[PDB]
Scaffold this active site. Sequence first.
Site, PDB file in Angstrom:
ATOM      1  N   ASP A  97       0.828  -1.211   0.000  1.00  0.00           N
ATOM      2  CA  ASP A  97       0.000   0.000   0.000  1.00  0.00           C
ATOM      3  C   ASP A  97       0.864   1.262   0.000  1.00  0.00           C
ATOM      4  O   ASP A  97       1.261   1.741   1.064  1.00  0.00           O
ATOM      5  CB  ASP A  97      -0.923  -0.033   1.209  1.00  0.00           C
ATOM      6  CG  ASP A  97      -1.925   1.102   1.212  1.00  0.00           C
ATOM      7  OD1 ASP A  97      -1.915   1.916   0.264  1.00  0.00           O
ATOM      8  OD2 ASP A  97      -2.725   1.164   2.166  1.00  0.00           O
ATOM      9  N   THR A  98       1.107   1.829  -1.188  1.00  0.00           N
ATOM     10  CA  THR A  98       1.892   3.056  -1.286  1.00  0.00           C
ATOM     11  C   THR A  98       1.174   4.261  -0.689  1.00  0.00           C
ATOM     12  O   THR A  98       1.823   5.273  -0.406  1.00  0.00           O
ATOM     13  CB  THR A  98       2.247   3.351  -2.746  1.00  0.00           C
ATOM     14  OG1 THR A  98       1.051   3.436  -3.533  1.00  0.00           O
ATOM     15  CG2 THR A  98       3.161   2.264  -3.306  1.00  0.00           C
ATOM     16  N   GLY A  99      -0.136   4.176  -0.491  1.00  0.00           N
ATOM     17  CA  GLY A  99      -0.912   5.232   0.119  1.00  0.00           C
ATOM     18  C   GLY A  99      -1.019   5.159   1.626  1.00  0.00           C
ATOM     19  O   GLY A  99      -1.798   5.914   2.219  1.00  0.00           O
TER      20      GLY A  99
HETATM   21  C1  OQV Z   1     -11.835  -1.312  -1.200  1.00  0.00           C
HETATM   22  O1  OQV Z   1     -11.669  -0.200  -0.368  1.00  0.00           O
HETATM   23  C2  OQV Z   1     -10.724   0.737  -0.794  1.00  0.00           C
HETATM   24  O2  OQV Z   1      -9.996   0.510  -1.711  1.00  0.00           O
HETATM   25  N1  OQV Z   1     -10.664   1.999  -0.084  1.00  0.00           N
HETATM   26  C3  OQV Z   1      -9.556   2.915  -0.282  1.00  0.00           C
HETATM   27  C4  OQV Z   1      -8.751   2.941   1.019  1.00  0.00           C
HETATM   28  O3  OQV Z   1      -9.030   3.659   1.925  1.00  0.00           O
HETATM   29  N2  OQV Z   1      -7.634   2.022   1.116  1.00  0.00           N
HETATM   30  C5  OQV Z   1      -6.815   1.933   2.310  1.00  0.00           C
HETATM   31  C6  OQV Z   1      -6.804   0.476   2.767  1.00  0.00           C
HETATM   32  C7  OQV Z   1      -8.210  -0.110   2.795  1.00  0.00           C
HETATM   33  C8  OQV Z   1      -9.220   0.378   3.822  1.00  0.00           C
HETATM   34  C9  OQV Z   1     -10.626  -0.207   3.847  1.00  0.00           C
HETATM   35  C10 OQV Z   1     -11.018  -1.291   2.849  1.00  0.00           C
HETATM   36  C11 OQV Z   1     -10.005  -1.783   1.822  1.00  0.00           C
HETATM   37  C12 OQV Z   1      -8.599  -1.194   1.798  1.00  0.00           C
HETATM   38  C13 OQV Z   1      -5.365   2.293   2.027  1.00  0.00           C
HETATM   39  C14 OQV Z   1      -5.235   3.630   1.315  1.00  0.00           C
HETATM   40  O4  OQV Z   1      -3.953   3.684   0.765  1.00  0.00           O
HETATM   41  C15 OQV Z   1      -5.435   4.795   2.285  1.00  0.00           C
HETATM   42  C16 OQV Z   1      -5.411   6.087   1.479  1.00  0.00           C
HETATM   43  C17 OQV Z   1      -5.375   7.265   2.444  1.00  0.00           C
HETATM   44  C18 OQV Z   1      -4.092   8.065   2.634  1.00  0.00           C
HETATM   45  C19 OQV Z   1      -4.067   9.242   3.603  1.00  0.00           C
HETATM   46  C20 OQV Z   1      -5.318   9.617   4.380  1.00  0.00           C
HETATM   47  C21 OQV Z   1      -6.599   8.818   4.188  1.00  0.00           C
HETATM   48  C22 OQV Z   1      -6.629   7.644   3.222  1.00  0.00           C
HETATM   49  N3  OQV Z   1      -4.347   4.854   3.240  1.00  0.00           N
HETATM   50  C23 OQV Z   1      -4.538   4.621   4.655  1.00  0.00           C
HETATM   51  O5  OQV Z   1      -5.620   4.560   5.145  1.00  0.00           O
HETATM   52  O6  OQV Z   1      -3.367   4.476   5.402  1.00  0.00           O
HETATM   53  C24 OQV Z   1      -3.437   4.493   6.892  1.00  0.00           C
HETATM   54  C25 OQV Z   1      -2.600   3.721   7.323  1.00  0.00           C
HETATM   55  O7  OQV Z   1      -1.321   4.509   7.269  1.00  0.00           O
HETATM   56  C26 OQV Z   1      -1.768   5.967   7.473  1.00  0.00           C
HETATM   57  O8  OQV Z   1      -1.227   6.900   6.255  1.00  0.00           O
HETATM   58  C27 OQV Z   1      -2.241   7.233   5.532  1.00  0.00           C
HETATM   59  C28 OQV Z   1      -3.387   7.111   6.419  1.00  0.00           C
HETATM   60  C29 OQV Z   1      -2.973   5.969   7.443  1.00  0.00           C
HETATM   61  C30 OQV Z   1     -10.102   4.277  -0.701  1.00  0.00           C
HETATM   62  C31 OQV Z   1     -10.672   4.123  -2.111  1.00  0.00           C
HETATM   63  C32 OQV Z   1     -11.201   4.786   0.236  1.00  0.00           C
HETATM   64  C33 OQV Z   1      -8.952   5.280  -0.738  1.00  0.00           C
END
Ligand code: OQV
Lengths: 99, 99
Positions: free
Chosen positions: A25-27
């Site tokens: 997860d690069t995000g």
């Molecule tokens: C199928 O569902 C999806 O695909 N949902 C997608 C999603 O939310 N994906 C999540 C994992 C996930 C969660 C729930 C179900 C499936 C996968 C990972 C994603 O990269 C987020 C992006 C993000 C960055 C910064 C602030 C808020 C959000 N990153 C994160 O939450 O990281 C956490 C952890 O580390 C911290 O840094 C950044 C914030 C902290 C989305 C389309 C809504 C974007």
Amino acid sequence: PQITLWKRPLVTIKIGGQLKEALLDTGADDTVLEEMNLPGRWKPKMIGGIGGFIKVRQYDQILIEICGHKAIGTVLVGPTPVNIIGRNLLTQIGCTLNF
Amino acid sequence: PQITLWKRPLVTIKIGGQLKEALLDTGADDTVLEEMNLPGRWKPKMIGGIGGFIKVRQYDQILIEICGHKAIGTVLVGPTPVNIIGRNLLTQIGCTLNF
Ligand SMILES: COC(=O)N[C@H](C(=O)N[C@@H](Cc1ccccc1)C[C@H](O)[C@H](Cc1ccccc1)NC(=O)O[C@H]1CO[C@H]2OCC[C@H]21)C(C)(C)C
């Protein structure tokens, strides 16, 4: 290896001697794993993403093997919907984005 | 090009005639952008992150240019803290993970 993104970039990880599936997860700034038992001390923490915050247990300097590559760093354990490997560990295994 | 993960992988995108900064997110199924008033028809949707679900507006067949690479697909718009480029568009620009 080179991983395309037509499907979720899920890989097998080994942590605390147990195998699990996790999302590269690069995000994610941080690595967050579903509820599990891990040896060592831990501190309460909270992390936010889309939808709000969850309460997690922060383990520091945890060994974790990601797709055959070792890392030692911070692992958050809590009610995450999916095991996510964040940038704190992706950098350790030399992971980059390329296009 | 190649992008390391020491910092958030933020890049410039072009959408609906505007330049924005967005996160290349291999952990995102979908593309979610901060509130903006795009023209055309849309449909309500709800998407889930680690903390729960948010309401967004779904726009289809939207063009986004990502670092000079064009992609056309579904773009969601709602109260996200960061512009997020998800796999539905990252695949179209030939983006991969490499380690
Ligand atoms: C199928 O569902 C999806 O695909 N949902 C997608 C999603 O939310 N994906 C999540 C994992 C996930 C969660 C729930 C179900 C499936 C996968 C990972 C994603 O990269 C987020 C992006 C993000 C960055 C910064 C602030 C808020 C959000 N990153 C994160 O939450 O990281 C956490 C952890 O580390 C911290 O840094 C950044 C914030 C902290 C989305 C389309 C809504 C974007």
